[PDB]
């Protein structure tokens, strides 16, 4: 899959932008380590993507201006990496002894961002983190 929804919400008068992002089908190695483009996480590329996408969406080609803008800065990059970190860490602690996943394993983790567009602040709605996972035939 690899599928990116959006919808604004209002916050007194600051619009922020709700993402529903999926992963698509993985395995831990593309999407955390270094199996993935490059030598490198396919998670940031896919989340960067979603980004930049869901503002597109909801603000037109200005989107791209505010992407631009909040791309390199202190507070998206930071709580992209808080992200990173915490979906890693719900993957490998809760998840995998959870459905007692086996490496190679595949999978698709969806869950729900909301993103402030002013601060490029990202926050993650870790009550809605689904995983759908492939289980060997056998069992």
Same mark, same amino acid.
């Given at each position: 899959?690899?599928?990116?929804?959006?919808?604004?919400i209002?916050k007194?008068?600051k619009?922020?932008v709700?993402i529903?992002?999926?992963?698509?089908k993985?395995?831990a190695?593309?999407?955390?380590?270094?199996?993935?483009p490059?030598?490198?996480?396919?998670?940031?590329?896919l989340?960067?993507?979603?980004?930049?996408?869901s503002?597109?969406? %909801?603000?037109?080609?200005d989107?791209?201006?505010i992407?631009?803008?909040?791309?390199?800065?202190?507070?998206?990059?930071?709580?992209?990496?808080?992200?990173?970190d915490?979906l890693?860490?719900w993957?490998?602690e809760?998840?995998?002894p959870?459905?007692?996943?086996?490496?190679?394993?595949?999978?698709m983790?969806?869950?729900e961002?909301?993103?402030?567009?002013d601060?490029?602040?990202?926050?993650?709605?870790?009550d809605?983190? %689904?995983?759908?996972?492939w289980i060997?035939?056998?069992?």
């Amino acid at each position: 899959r690899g599928e990116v929804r959006s919808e604004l919400i209002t916050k007194g008068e600051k619009k922020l932008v709700l993402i529903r992002w999926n992963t698509g089908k993985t395995s831990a190695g593309r999407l955390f380590g270094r199996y993935g483009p490059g030598g490198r996480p396919e998670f940031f590329k896919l989340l960067f993507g979603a980004v930049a996408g869901s503002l597109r969406e %909801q603000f037109g080609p200005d989107g791209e201006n505010i992407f631009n803008r909040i791309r390199d800065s202190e507070k998206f990059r930071e709580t992209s990496r808080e992200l990173f970190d915490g979906l890693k860490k719900w993957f490998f602690e809760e998840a995998v002894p959870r459905y007692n996943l086996e490496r190679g394993d595949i999978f698709m983790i969806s869950t729900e961002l909301v993103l402030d567009p002013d601060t490029g602040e990202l926050l993650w709605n870790r009550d809605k983190t %689904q995983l759908i996972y492939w289980i060997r035939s056998d069992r």
